[PDB]
Design a protein around this ligand. Structure first.
Ligand SMILES: CC(C)CCC[C@@H](C)[C@H]1CC[C@H]2[C@@H]3CC=C4C[C@@H](OC(=O)CCC(=O)O)CC[C@]4(C)[C@H]3CC[C@]12C
Ligand SMILES: CC(C)CCC[C@@H](C)[C@H]1CC[C@H]2[C@@H]3CC=C4C[C@@H](OC(=O)CCC(=O)O)CC[C@]4(C)[C@H]3CC[C@]12C
Ligand SMILES: CC(C)CCC[C@@H](C)[C@H]1CC[C@H]2[C@@H]3CC=C4C[C@@H](OC(=O)CCC(=O)O)CC[C@]4(C)[C@H]3CC[C@]12C
Ligand SMILES: C[N+](C)(C)CCO
Length: 419
């Protein structure tokens, strides 16, 4: 069949990244300056942590229905839903700048959480539908890097945008309103652009494989049967548990980073955001390097196990070096830990995909993400309680123990797959 590539693809991809990026920002805007918000709303730190945990909670039940909707109705509807939900949540947050309106901010965060479900699955679908065979991998990498950059910007900007001024409540409200209004304006512009230019599919197929897929009639897929078959594979279950543990540890560290840093470094919220951004950027670099290393070696289990062990070592180093009262040490430790942790994620994801080659990639991706969300919620709750009661060291040691368990599980995995 005739195959052509149009410039619109890039626009589409760009737009997606942007309205993915903002979403990631909204995930971590509250946590990085949680203490300040704790002062503004007169709530507990658990209230602020739930603003991060709602993203994880919403994904698990709605992912599979969201995947079914994406398959049945196409990419355009999913993109529109995600962008509109993000914009509406941003506006609701804009309407929540008051000491007695924490529930409005929670509603906005819930809307953004529902939006996230419609965004995480779009990268590969867009890359296939709009990009040629050579550019699929690069398009997907850019799409995911958009969300990761959004997380980094959420780590960095809010500390600067909203200085901690409990003495002056009006100034704090003004800064919070400014941040919310900026996010809302960006989200609204991105939603308008998605509506205007986010077409369902290109005029001509981008590749022969996509041409065959579009030409081929749709086929019914049993998500429940696929999940049951996937759970039958013990190696897949072990890899799911390990990936969930790693991603949940990352989420817990991100959510509670401000609480950990403020314990020993008071008045360093900006430095905490810088540490988070360094962690995320080192994670991006480590992900790229690990992808290249896996491509060159063609080894999955060995590379994944080495990366897991290095992540555990970095976690231990960060755990037992936070109290030295040297901010630069925290910077370096967080950079190394993010490098290794984020490098693990693509390796484990690709290992899961190849282990379950007969099964659909979408179902395995949904299972991996749901395990990540569940482990993130559990780790966030446990580590927050440990930090509140016994101090950050207890929660960090808890994370290290879970990482050791994950290392054991990864070692136990049996796989002859090579690639
Ligand atoms: C629509 C989808 C995205 C699901 C929406 C679920 C949320 C609205 C729920 C899930 C868990 C809930 C939280 C579960 C536990 C708590 C702790 C709870 O704390 C207390 O009551 C004690 C506070 C104190 O120690 O003084 C306050 C409500 C809160 C944050 C809840 C707020 C509402 C949450 C975030
Ligand atoms: C990683 C470990 C720690 C937790 C693994 C939990 C999963 C087995 C859960 C998480 C989300 C669940 C799904 C959430 C929603 C649905 C939709 C639900 O839809 C229906 O009720 C109709 C199904 C049909 O059309 O037959 C079917 C079960 C399913 C796929 C659930 C199956 C079980 C899942 C995959
Ligand atoms: C796989 C799952 C089921 C493992 C769960 C293990 C947890 C129950 C462990 C992991 C980290 C442990 C904590 C690590 C460090 C400490 C500090 C320790 O502090 C003290 O009061 C004694 C030492 C001191 O004086 O500092 C008290 C126990 C506690 C909270 C530990 C309690 C038990 C925890 C939470
Ligand atoms: C996937 N994110 C990191 C964007 C949110 C986790 O709840």
């Amino acid at each position: 069949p005739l195959t052509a590539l149009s410039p619109r693809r890039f626009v589409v991809l760009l737009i997606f990244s942007l309205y993915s990026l903002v979403n990631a920002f909204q995930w971590i805007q509250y946590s990085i300056i949680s203490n300040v918000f704790e002062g503004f709303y007169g709530v507990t730190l658990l209230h602020i942590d739930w603003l991060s945990m709602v993203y994880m909670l919403a994904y698990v039940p709605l992912i599979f229905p969201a995947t079914w909707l994406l398959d049945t109705r196409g990419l355009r509807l999913t993109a529109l839903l995600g962008s509109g939900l993000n914009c509406l949540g941003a506006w609701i947050k804009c309407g929540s700048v008051q000491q007695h309106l924490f529930w409005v901010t929670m509603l906005g965060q819930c809307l953004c959480s529902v939006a996230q479900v419609f965004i995480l699955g779009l990268p590969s679908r867009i890359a296939s539908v709009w990009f040629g065979p050579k550019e699929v991998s690069t398009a997907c990498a850019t799409a995911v890097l958009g969300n990761q950059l959004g997380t980094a910007v959420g780590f960095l900007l809010p500390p600067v945008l909203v200085p901690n001024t409990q003495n002056d409540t009006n100034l704090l409200a003004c800064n919070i309103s400014t941040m919310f209004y900026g996010t809302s304006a960006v989200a609204t512009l991105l939603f308008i652009l998605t509506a205007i230019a986010f077409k369902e599919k290109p005029r001509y197929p981008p590749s022969q494989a996509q041409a065959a897929l579009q030409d081929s009639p749709p086929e019914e897929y049993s998500y429940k049967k696929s999940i049951r078959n996937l759970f039958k594979n013990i190696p897949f279950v072990l890899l799911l548990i390990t990936y969930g543990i790693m991603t949940g540890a990352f989420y817990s560290v991100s959510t509670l980073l401000n609480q950990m840093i403020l314990t020993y470094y008071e008045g360093e919220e900006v430095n905490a955001g810088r540490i988070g951004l360094t962690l995320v950027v080192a994670g991006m670099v480590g992900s790229i390097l690990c992808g290249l290393w896996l491509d060159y070696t063609k080894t999955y289990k060995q590379t994944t196990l080495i990366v897991y062990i290095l992540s555990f070592i970095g976690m231990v180093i960060f755990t037992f070096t936070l109290d030295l009262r040297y901010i630069i040490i925290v910077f370096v430790t967080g950079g190394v830990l993010g490098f290794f942790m984020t490098g693990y994620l693509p390796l484990g994801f690709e290992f899961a995909v190849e282990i379950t080659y007969p099964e659909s990639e979408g179902t395995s991706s949904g299972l991996l993400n749901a395990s990540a969300q569940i482990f993130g919620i559990l780790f966030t709750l446990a580590q927050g309680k440990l930090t509140s009661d016994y101090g950050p060291k207890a929660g960090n040691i808890f994370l290290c123990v879970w990482m050791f368990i994950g290392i054991i599980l990864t070692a136990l995995i049996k796989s002859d797959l090579r690639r």
